Design a protein around this ligand. Structure first.
Ligand code: SF4
Ligand SMILES: [Mg+2]
Ligand SMILES: [Mg+2]
Ligand SMILES: [Mg+2]
Ligand SMILES: [Mg+2]
Ligand SMILES: [Mg+2]
Ligand SMILES: [Mg+2]
Lengths: 447, 112
RNA sequence: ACUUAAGCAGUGGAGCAUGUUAUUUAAUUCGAUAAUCCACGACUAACCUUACCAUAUUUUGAAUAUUAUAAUAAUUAUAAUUAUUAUAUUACAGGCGUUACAUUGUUGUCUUUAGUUCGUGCUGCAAAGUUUUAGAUUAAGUUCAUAAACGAACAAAACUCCAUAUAUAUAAUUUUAAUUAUAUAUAAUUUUAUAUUAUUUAUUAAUAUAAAGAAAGGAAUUAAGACAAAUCAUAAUGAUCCUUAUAAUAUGGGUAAUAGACGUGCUAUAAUAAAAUGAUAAUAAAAUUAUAUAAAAUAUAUUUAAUUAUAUUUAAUUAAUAAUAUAAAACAUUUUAAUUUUUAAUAUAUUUUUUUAUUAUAAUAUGAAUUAUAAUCUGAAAUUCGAUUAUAUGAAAAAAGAAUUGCUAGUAAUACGUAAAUUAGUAUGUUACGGUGAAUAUUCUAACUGUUUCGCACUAAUCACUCAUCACGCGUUGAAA
């Protein structure tokens, strides 16, 4: 008789496993690899993988044609999964009604990948005005991108660079905010400043990155520069934020204060004192198509470089902003809501607005023991919280909590609500002359 | 409800956890009711006896509580209480066996 | 030089078993998640185990201590103290709660272990260095040699321990296996002699040939760094959380659900191979039996008997004694679909268990999944959900391939069996034990390690350091209508 609440269902993130469109996968397996003997495709894919194992490395545009084929074979799947999950999140958190964008820009290294994901998400009847798609790495990626997009039903415009005379209302960025291991803090600023100029009022920007500590640091910096948390202290909740221009975080963040997990420099993760550091990433599972299953075979991609699955778990970090509209109403509305709305210090345990926009974010796999569920949340209080839901507190809420997963929004109260210790190893991030003088002093003291 | 089991039973002298207490209680009550269980089983399993006597004996057998059942006794490690990989020669789980054997606690046991 | 590559021997498209995952579920207890791959423990999940779910029920609970009471025994001089047991009392106990709960520790893996310190001595003003040497040799630190160095301690080696061969002792040779057992000791890290090759010239090494030998294998034994690990079930401590419940008990349910995907194993897909039979009983080892083991016999399936499976009855033995238990492959005969390569009728023969002539004459007599019926076994209980037998049923599985396993060895392989642990009961798993007993040769590639050459503005040591930029001020100086 006990079932999930409608509120809890609203808080849940898209749970189903990912799968490519059957037409897209069949086309890929038939054309993009059937002309290739597996061994050399595996060789090039191994080359690409080995240069992204390096800690806090970055993705890299496909230089050559064989690299185009290899990228579609090996890197396309997880990029598609990340964009699909991010777009489902956006659609749900703005309501499926308000998400009918007409001016679409997708920028990434793979084929038109946010475009095919958007096609899958909004169905075969979605036929918007403009479906620009800039492909960076190579010209030949565009031809196979047309091959992919043919099997979905073309009005997708495959470019090599951003058209520079138009705004957009849905922009997708995949691995685009950084290109150098060094240069890291400021290239993010430059790149986001570039794409925010072309974000139409009311539009969405969806940023997706690798899902490793470097990727999380990129999203954290991109969040910080857009928001300026330090410039609006004691401002809880989500109000659009200046950057006539305003923008608000939709997902995954339930607040606009300082990210609790951010330590500025990615290199701290590499040390032996930042090994307990935590970073904000999210996981999904995606079925392996045949061409993927047939690729990862042999001593190159199947052994341990020093049972299989039918799916891959992809890690990714992501961020979503909306730009406000332009109107005398909206402007003065933001001013008044910032002026006379003392929303109050959102204390630990608060749910904020008790809507999608302020519900806590589950950012760790909850621990589910008999009669109690422990969740690590990024709360709307700007902080990192640990909530325990027990049966004795409430049968219904415990029932809902026992099915919650990482990446959901937790929409219900809990009994025990304490400060999470995931940020413990964060705050903790001339002697030569003293040694010399002490040496001489002790040496003259022995006498 | 001072005692968790229906019949007061002395604690074992060594390591204790709830599972050791449950097993020890079942062992004590099996000892106490073994003759009754065997007599009832004999009455039930003797085809020379009338069918009503046999059915009555079987009914009384099914009516007995779980702590008289021989099949419910499980050998646990006397040192840790674990119920897997228990060597009956020492009543120890395999790890506790190795620890005690290397400490010289087990008489006669040597590294091979 | 791990790895690759080559060669040899396999396994490998199906069914089932067993795991993991996905989905499902009240629960399907728990396990991975920084982009090649990879969530994966079971010496036994019906109840128990159990950690999970449902429903009931318990509330100082398993502990220690305090304070009262109610008895019960000992002692005072009759009350009292002393103890023991119950009841209550509250500090609490309890926690398969938390690793996004941190420390040590420990454990695993990997790199290095002829090297690290100390003492003297020697060189340089000194910090430092200790010099041949980037030595020879071996598969290997293996075996040697050498130097302004020489020692010591550890480490390595020797040593030690198994095994093997031999000697002594022991056994009243019916606990018999004296072809044995198990104590002690010995042996080898083998040695000698020539010849040819090389040599740092022999008193060296290798090969060959002789000589003496039984002599041919294996294990353990220290530290130092790096990373991983909370079924860390290799702990302890601490922190934090629950305290009518995140503790505790009972009944039933689940862990056994089924779209998929994959790992491992078992049985197969027939003739260098399966089946049946083989009684003065072809030929083993290593284990087990007081929380047993089950002999022979009898009865039923069942058919003269045998075989096989149960039941009845429990002989012996708690064991060098008796039992589990007559090892099995091997070997011999017979049989075997595809196969008209056969069977049968007549003749026929100096092939007679046979020959000849003329006539007729893709799944089997492979495989054993699934299912039906009737029995049996253990257990209190076999419904979810166990094992066995009989009568039926009789599926997939034929061709070629990714893929992978192991590699001189008493190893692989074996339609060779045998035993034990964990059980009341169930092994195709694990660990042991013996029987039979092979093939092949290694062009290649190599992370990584150790020596080295060279440079060095770095020394918390390149995630280094300097240089330069941009802003903010506070100075100083110069030229000036
Ligand atoms: S959800 Fe929270 S932890 Fe994650 S990026 Fe946003 S603010 Fe940071
Ligand atoms: Mg049992
Ligand atoms: Mg159970
Ligand atoms: Mg139960
Ligand atoms: Mg405690
Ligand atoms: Mg518990
Ligand atoms: Mg048959």
């Amino acid at each position: 008789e006990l079932r999930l609440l409608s509120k809890t269902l609203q808080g849940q993130s898209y749970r189903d496993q990912l799968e490519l469109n059957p037409d897209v996968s069949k086309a890929i397996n038939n054309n993009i690899m059937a002309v290739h003997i597996p061994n050399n495709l595996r060789r090039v894919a191994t080359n690409y993988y080995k240069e992204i194992q390096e800690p806090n490395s970055l993705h890299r545009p496909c230089r050559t044609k064989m690299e185009v084929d290899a990228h579609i074979a090996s890197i396309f799947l997880q990029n598609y999964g990340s964009i699909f999950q991010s777009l489902k999140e956006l659609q749900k958190r703005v309501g499926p009604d308000n998400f009918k964008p007409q001016r679409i820009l997708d920028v990434g290294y793979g084929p038109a990948t946010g475009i095919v994901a958007l096609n899958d998400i909004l169905g075969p009847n979605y036929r918007p005005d403009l479906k620009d798609a800039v492909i960076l790495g190579n010209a030949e990626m565009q031809e196979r991108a047309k091959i992919i997009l043919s099997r979905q039903l073309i009005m997708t415009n495959l470019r090599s660079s951003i058209p520079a005379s138009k705004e957009y209302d849905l922009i997708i960025l995949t691995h685009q905010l950084l290109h150098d291991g060094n240069q890291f803090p400021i290239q993010v600023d430059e790149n986001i400043e570039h794409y925010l100029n072309i974000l139409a009022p009311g539009g969405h920007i969806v940023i997706i990155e690798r899902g490793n500590p470097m990727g999380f640091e990129i999203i954290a910096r991109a969040r910080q520069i857009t928001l300026r948390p330090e410039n609006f202290p004691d401002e809880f909740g989500k109000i659009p934020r200046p950057w006539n221009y305003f923008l608000k975080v939709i997902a995954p963040c339930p607040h606009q204060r300082k990210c609790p997990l951010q330590v500025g420099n990615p290199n701290f993760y590499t040390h032996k004192e930042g090994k307990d550091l935590k970073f904000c990433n999210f996981q999904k599972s995606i079925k392996r198509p045949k061409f993927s299953i047939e690729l990862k075979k042999g001593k190159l991609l199947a052994t341990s470089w020093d049972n299989g699955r039918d799916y891959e778990i992809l890690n990714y970090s992501y961020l979503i902003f909306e730009r406000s509209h332009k109107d005398e109403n909206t402007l003065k509305e933001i001013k008044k809501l910032r002026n006379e709305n003392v929303n109050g210090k959102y204390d630990i345990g608060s749910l904020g607005d008790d809507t999608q926009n302020s519900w806590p974010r589950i950012i760790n796999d909850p621990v589910k023991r008999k009669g109690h569920v422990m969740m690590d949340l990024c709360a709307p209080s700007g902080e990192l919280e640990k909530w325990t839901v027990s049966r004795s507190f409430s049968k219904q809420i415990y029932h809902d909590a026992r099915k919650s997963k990482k990446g959901d929004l937790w929409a219900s109260a809990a009994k025990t609500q304490i400060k999470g210790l995931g940020d413990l190893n964060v705050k903790k991030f001339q002697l030569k002359k003293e040694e010399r003088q002490k040496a001489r002093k002790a040496m003259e003291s022995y006498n | 409800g001072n005692f968790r089991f229906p019949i007061k039973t002395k604690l074992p002298p060594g390591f204790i956890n709830a599972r050791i207490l449950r097993d020890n209680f079942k062992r004590q009550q099996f000892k106490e009711n073994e003759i009754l269980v065997k007599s009832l089983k004999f009455i039930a399993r003797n085809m020379n006896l009338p069918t009503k006597l046999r059915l009555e004996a079987q009914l009384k057998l099914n009516a007995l509580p779980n702590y008289m059942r021989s099949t419910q006794i499980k050998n646990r490690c006397v040192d840790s209480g674990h119920a897997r990989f228990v060597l009956s020669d020492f009543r120890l789980c395999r790890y506790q066996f190795r620890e005690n054997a290397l400490k010289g606690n087990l008489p006669g046991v040597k590294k091979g």
